[PDB]
Every structure is written in C-alpha cells, then in structure tokens.
PDB file of C-alpha atoms in Angstrom:
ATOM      1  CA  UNK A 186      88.994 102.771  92.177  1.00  0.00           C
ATOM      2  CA  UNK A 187      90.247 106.281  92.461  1.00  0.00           C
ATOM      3  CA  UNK A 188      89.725 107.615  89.211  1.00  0.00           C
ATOM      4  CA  UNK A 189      85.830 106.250  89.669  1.00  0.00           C
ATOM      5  CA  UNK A 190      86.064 108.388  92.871  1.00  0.00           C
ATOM      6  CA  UNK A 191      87.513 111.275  90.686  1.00  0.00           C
ATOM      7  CA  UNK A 192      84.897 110.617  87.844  1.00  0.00           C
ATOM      8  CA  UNK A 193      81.869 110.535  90.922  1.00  0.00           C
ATOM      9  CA  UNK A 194      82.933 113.821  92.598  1.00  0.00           C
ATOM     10  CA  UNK A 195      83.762 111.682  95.789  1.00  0.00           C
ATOM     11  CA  UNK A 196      86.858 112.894  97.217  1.00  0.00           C
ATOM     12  CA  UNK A 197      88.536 112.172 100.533  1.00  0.00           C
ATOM     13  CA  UNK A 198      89.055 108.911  99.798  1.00  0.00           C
ATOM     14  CA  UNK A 199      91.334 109.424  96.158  1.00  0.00           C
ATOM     15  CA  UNK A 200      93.653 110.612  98.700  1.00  0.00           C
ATOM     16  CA  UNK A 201      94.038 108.135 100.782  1.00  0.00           C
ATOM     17  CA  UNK A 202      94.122 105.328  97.865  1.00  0.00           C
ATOM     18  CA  UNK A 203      97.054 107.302  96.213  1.00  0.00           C
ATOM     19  CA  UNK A 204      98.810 107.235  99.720  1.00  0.00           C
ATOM     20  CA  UNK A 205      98.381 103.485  99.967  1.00  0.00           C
ATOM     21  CA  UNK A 206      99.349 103.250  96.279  1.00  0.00           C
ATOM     22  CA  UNK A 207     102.663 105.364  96.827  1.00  0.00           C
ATOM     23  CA  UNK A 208     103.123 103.200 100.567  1.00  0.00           C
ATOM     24  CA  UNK A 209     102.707  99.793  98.168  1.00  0.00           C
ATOM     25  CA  UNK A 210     104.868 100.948  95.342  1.00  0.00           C
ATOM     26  CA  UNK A 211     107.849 102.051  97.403  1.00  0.00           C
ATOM     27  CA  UNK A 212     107.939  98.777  98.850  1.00  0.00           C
ATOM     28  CA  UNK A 213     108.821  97.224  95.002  1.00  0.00           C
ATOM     29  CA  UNK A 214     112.021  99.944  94.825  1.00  0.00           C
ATOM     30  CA  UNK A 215     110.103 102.555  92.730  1.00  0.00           C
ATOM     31  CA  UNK A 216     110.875 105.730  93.891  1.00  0.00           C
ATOM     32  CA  UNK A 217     109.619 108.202  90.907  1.00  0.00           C
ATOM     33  CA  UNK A 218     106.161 106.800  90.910  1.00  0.00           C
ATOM     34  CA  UNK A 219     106.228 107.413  95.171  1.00  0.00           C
ATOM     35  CA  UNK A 220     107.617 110.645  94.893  1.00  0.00           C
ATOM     36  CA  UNK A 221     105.139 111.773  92.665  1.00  0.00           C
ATOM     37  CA  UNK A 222     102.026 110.106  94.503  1.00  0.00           C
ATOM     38  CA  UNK A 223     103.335 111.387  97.739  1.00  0.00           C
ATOM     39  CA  UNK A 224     104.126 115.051  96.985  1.00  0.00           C
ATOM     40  CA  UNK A 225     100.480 115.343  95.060  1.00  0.00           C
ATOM     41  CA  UNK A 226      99.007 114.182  98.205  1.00  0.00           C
ATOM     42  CA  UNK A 227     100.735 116.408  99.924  1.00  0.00           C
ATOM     43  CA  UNK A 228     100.204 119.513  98.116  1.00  0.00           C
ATOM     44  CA  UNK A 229      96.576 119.001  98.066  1.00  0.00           C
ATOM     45  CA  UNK A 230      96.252 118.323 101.968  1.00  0.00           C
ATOM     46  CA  UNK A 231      98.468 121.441 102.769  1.00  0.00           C
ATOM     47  CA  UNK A 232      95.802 123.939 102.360  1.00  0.00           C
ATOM     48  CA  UNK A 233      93.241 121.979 104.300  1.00  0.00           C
ATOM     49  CA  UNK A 234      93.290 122.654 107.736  1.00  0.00           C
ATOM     50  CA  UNK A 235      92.285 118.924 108.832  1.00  0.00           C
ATOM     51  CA  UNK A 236      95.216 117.308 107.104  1.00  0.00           C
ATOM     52  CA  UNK A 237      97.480 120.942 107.250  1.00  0.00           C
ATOM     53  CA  UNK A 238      99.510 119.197 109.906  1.00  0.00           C
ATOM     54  CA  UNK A 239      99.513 115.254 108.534  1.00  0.00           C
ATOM     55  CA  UNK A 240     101.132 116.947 105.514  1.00  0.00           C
ATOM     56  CA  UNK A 241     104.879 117.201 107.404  1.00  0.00           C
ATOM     57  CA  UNK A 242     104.273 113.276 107.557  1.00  0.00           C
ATOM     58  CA  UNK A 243     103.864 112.940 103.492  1.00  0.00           C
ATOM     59  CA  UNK A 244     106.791 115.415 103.205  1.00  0.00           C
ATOM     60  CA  UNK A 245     109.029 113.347 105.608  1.00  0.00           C
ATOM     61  CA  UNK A 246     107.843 110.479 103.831  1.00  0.00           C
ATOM     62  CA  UNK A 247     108.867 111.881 100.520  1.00  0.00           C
ATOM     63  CA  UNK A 248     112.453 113.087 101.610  1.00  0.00           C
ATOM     64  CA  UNK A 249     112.855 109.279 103.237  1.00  0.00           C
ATOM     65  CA  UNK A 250     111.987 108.059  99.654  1.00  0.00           C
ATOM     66  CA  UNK A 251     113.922 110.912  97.676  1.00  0.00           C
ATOM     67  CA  UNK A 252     116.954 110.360 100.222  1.00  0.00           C
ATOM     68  CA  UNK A 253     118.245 107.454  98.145  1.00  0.00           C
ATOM     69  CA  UNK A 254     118.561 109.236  94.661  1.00  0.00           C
ATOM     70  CA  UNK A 255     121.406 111.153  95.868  1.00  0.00           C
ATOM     71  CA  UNK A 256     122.528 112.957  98.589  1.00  0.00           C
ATOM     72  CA  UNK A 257     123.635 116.214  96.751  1.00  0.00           C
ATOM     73  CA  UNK A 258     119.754 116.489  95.684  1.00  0.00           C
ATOM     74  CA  UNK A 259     118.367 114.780  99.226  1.00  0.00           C
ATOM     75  CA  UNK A 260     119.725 117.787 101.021  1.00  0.00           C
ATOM     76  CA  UNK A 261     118.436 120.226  98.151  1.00  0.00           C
ATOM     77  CA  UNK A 262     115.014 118.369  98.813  1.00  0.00           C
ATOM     78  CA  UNK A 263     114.792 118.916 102.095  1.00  0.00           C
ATOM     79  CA  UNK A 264     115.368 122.405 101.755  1.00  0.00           C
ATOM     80  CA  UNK A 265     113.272 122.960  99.341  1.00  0.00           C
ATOM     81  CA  UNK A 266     110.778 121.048 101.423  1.00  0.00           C
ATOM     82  CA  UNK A 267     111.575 123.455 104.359  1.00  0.00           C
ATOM     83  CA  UNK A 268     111.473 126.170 102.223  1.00  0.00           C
ATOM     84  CA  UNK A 269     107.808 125.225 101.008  1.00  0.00           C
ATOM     85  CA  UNK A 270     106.650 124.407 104.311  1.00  0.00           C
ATOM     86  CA  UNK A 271     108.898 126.274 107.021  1.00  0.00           C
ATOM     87  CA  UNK A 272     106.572 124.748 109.757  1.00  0.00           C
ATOM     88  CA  UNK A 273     108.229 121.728 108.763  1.00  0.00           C
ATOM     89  CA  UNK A 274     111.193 122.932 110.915  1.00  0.00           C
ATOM     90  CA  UNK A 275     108.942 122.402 113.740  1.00  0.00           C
ATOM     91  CA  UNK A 276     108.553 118.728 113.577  1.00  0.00           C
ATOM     92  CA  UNK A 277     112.073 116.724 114.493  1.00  0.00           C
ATOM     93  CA  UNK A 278     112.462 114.868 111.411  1.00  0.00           C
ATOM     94  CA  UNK A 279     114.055 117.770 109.803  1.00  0.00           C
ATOM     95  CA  UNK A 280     116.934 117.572 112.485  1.00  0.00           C
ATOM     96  CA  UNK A 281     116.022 114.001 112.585  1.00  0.00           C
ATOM     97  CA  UNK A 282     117.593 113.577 108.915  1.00  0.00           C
ATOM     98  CA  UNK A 283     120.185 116.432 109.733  1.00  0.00           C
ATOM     99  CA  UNK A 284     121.688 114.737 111.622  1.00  0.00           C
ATOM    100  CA  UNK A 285     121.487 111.564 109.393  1.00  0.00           C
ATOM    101  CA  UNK A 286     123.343 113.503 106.847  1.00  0.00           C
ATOM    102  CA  UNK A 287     125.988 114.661 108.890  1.00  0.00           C
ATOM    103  CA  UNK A 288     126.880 111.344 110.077  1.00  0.00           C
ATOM    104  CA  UNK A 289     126.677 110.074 106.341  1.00  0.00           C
ATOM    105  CA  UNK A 290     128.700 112.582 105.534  1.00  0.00           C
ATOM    106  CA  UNK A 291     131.619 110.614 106.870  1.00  0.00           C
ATOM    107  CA  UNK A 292     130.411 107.202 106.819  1.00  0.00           C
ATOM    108  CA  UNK A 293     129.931 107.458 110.767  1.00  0.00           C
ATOM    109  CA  UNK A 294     127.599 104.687 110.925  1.00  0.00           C
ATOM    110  CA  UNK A 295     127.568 104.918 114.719  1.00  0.00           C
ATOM    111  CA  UNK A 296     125.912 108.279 114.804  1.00  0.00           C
ATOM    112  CA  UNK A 297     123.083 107.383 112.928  1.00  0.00           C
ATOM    113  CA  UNK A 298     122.671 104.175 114.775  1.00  0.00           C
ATOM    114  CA  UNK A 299     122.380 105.732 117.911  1.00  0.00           C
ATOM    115  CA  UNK A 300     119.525 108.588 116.056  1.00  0.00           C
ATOM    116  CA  UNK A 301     117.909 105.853 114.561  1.00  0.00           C
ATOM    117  CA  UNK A 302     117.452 103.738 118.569  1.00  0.00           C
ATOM    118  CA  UNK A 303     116.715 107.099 119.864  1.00  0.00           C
ATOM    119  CA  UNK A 304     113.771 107.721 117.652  1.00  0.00           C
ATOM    120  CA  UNK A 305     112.494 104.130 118.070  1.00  0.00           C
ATOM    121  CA  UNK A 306     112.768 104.529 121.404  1.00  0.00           C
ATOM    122  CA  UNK A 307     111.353 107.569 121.897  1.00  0.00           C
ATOM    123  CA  UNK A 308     108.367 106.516 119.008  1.00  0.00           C
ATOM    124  CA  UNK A 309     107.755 103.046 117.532  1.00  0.00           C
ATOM    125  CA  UNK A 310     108.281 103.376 113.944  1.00  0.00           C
ATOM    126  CA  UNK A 311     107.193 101.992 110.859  1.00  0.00           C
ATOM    127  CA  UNK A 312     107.824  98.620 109.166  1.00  0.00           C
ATOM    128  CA  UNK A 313     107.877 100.606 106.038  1.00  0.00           C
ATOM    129  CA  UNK A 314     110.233 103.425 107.628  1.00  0.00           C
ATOM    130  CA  UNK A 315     112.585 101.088 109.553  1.00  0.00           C
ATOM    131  CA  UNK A 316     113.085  99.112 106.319  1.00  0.00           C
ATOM    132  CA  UNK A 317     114.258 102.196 104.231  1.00  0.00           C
ATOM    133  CA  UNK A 318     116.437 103.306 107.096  1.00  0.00           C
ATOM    134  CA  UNK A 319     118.313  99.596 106.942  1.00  0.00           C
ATOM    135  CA  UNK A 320     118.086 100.396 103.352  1.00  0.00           C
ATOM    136  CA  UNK A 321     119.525 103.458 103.619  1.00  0.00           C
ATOM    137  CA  UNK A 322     122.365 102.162 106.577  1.00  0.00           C
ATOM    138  CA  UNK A 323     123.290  99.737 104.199  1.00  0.00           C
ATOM    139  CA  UNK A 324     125.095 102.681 101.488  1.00  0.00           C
TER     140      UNK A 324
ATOM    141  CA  UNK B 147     158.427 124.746 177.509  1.00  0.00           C
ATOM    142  CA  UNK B 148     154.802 123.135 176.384  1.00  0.00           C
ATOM    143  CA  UNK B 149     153.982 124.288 172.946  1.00  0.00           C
ATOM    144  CA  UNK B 150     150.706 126.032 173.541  1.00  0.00           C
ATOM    145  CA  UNK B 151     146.641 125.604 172.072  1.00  0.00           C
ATOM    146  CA  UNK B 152     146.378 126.823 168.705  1.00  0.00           C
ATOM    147  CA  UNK B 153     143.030 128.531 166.943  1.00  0.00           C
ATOM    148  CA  UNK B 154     140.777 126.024 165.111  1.00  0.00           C
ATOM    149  CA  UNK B 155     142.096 126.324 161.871  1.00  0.00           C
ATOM    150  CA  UNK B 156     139.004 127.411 160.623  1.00  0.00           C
ATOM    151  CA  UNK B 157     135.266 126.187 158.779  1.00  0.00           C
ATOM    152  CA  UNK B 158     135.544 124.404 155.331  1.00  0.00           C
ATOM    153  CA  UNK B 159     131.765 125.072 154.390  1.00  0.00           C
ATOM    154  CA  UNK B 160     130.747 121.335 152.704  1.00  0.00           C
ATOM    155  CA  UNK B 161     126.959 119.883 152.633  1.00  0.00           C
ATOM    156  CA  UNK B 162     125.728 116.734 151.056  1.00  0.00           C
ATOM    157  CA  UNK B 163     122.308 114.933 152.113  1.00  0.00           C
ATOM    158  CA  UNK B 164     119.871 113.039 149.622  1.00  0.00           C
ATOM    159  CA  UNK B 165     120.107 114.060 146.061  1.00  0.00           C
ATOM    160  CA  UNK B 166     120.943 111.464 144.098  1.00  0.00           C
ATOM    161  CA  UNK B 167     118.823 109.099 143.788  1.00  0.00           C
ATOM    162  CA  UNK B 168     115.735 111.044 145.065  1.00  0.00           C
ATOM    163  CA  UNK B 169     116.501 113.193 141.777  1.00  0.00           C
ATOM    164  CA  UNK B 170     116.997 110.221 139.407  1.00  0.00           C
ATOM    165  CA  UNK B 171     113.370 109.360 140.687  1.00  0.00           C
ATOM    166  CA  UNK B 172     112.149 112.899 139.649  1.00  0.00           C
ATOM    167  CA  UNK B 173     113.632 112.608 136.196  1.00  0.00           C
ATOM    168  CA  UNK B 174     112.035 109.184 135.477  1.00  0.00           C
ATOM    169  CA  UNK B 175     108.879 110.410 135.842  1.00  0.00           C
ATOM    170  CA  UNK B 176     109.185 113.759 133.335  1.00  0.00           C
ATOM    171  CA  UNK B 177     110.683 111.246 130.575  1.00  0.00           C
ATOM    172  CA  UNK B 178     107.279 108.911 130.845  1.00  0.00           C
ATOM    173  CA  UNK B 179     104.840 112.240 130.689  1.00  0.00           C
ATOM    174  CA  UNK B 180     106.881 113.212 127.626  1.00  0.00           C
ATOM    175  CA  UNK B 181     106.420 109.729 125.893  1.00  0.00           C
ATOM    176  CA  UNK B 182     102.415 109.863 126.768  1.00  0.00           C
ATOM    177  CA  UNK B 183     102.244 113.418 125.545  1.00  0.00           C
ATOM    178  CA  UNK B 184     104.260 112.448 122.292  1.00  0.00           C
ATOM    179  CA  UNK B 185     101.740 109.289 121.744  1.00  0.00           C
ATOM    180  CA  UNK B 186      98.852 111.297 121.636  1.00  0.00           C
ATOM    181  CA  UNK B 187      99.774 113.191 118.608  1.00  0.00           C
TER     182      UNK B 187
END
C-alpha cells in the first residue's frame, strides 16, 4: 500500500504506514528493519512544522529500539540523536534514559524501577514501550 | 534570710499554628494541574 501511495503522489499517509510497519516489526525482535523505518520517518517529519515536534517521539522511539544493540553505541545514539536534534534535550526522555543508563551502569535495578513507576505514573505508557522496558530490565 | 525574686529569665521566640496539613492540601492540587497540563500534549 505505500509504495502505491509513493507511485500516486499521495503522501501523508506513506508515513504513517511505515510507522505502523516499524511499530509491527519491532514487536517480532527486528530491530534493523525498525531502526531504519523509524529514523526515515523521522528525518522526513523534522522539517515539517506539523510533525517538527512528534519527531522527538520517533527519535525516542528509535533510541528505545537501538538501546538493546549495545550500550557503548545506545549512548553514542543518543548523542548523536541530541546532537541532530538539540531540542530533543527539551523533552524528558533524554534524562528519562540518562538516568536508565546510569542505573544500568551498575546493574542497580532499583533505580530504574523506581524511573520506570515514575513515568507511568506521571504518563500512561505504551504496551509497546512498557514491553521493551521489561525487555530491557530483564539484561 | 529569704532568697529573693529573680528576673524572668528571658523570651525564647517559638511559633507554630496550621501548616502542615493545610500545605499538603496546597501541594495536591499543583501535582493534578501538572498531570492535566501534561495530558494535553
């Protein structure tokens, strides 16, 4: 369906089927595939005003995927992310997954327990997000 | 021989009314308008 919509001149809506592609595909422990999808879709909505700001959701999406290649690399991504997108400081994911890392850093499991009930508490989250958090707990 | 008066030692300045809890009501109210203001997003 989305090459159709590239082959008809119709955009909007590629977007959003690569999103739910990337969404459906990380769910089946693909990560390159999502990583790809999700960056693309994120480059092309930074530039439009409309979506400028829904981009730092992609991104975060993206480091949540890239986070379990490695975590040498997972930092590098996220500061290449910030680096691309220094707004993205604003949002509190980027401390969000700080402090993440710092508690992985030692295997303090508590830490990030009590970051992960303070972001559901403060926001509902995702079934998508909460499952690659238990994911990522369970390193 | 009647040890005599002596001067009030003196004032020991201490005040405590109704803080607490009056306080703890303020507080749950800011939390709620940040959760609202965080929804709307």
């Amino acid at each position: 369906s989305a090459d159709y919509y590239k082959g008809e001149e119709s955009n909007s809506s590629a977007n959003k089927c690569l999103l739910k592609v990337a969404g459906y595909a990380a769910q089946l422990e693909q990560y390159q595939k999502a990583i790809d999808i999700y960056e693309q879709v994120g480059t092309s909505a930074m530039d439009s005003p409309l979506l400028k700001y829904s981009a730092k959701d992609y991104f975060f999406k993206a480091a949540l995927c890239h986070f379990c290649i490695d975590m040498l690399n997972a930092k590098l991504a996220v500061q290449k992310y910030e680096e691309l997108f220094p707004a993205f400081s604003d949002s509190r994911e980027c401390k969000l997954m700080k402090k993440l890392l710092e508690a992985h850093e030692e295997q303090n499991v508590d830490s990030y327990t009590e970051s992960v009930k303070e972001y559901d508490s403060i926001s509902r989250l995702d079934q998508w997000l909460t499952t690659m958090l238990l994911r990522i707990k369970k390193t | 021989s009647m040890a005599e008066d002596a001067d009030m030692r003196n004032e020991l300045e201490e005040m405590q009314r109704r803080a607490d809890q009056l306080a703890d009501e303020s507080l749950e109210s800011t939390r709620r308008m940040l959760q609202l203001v965080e929804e709307s997003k």
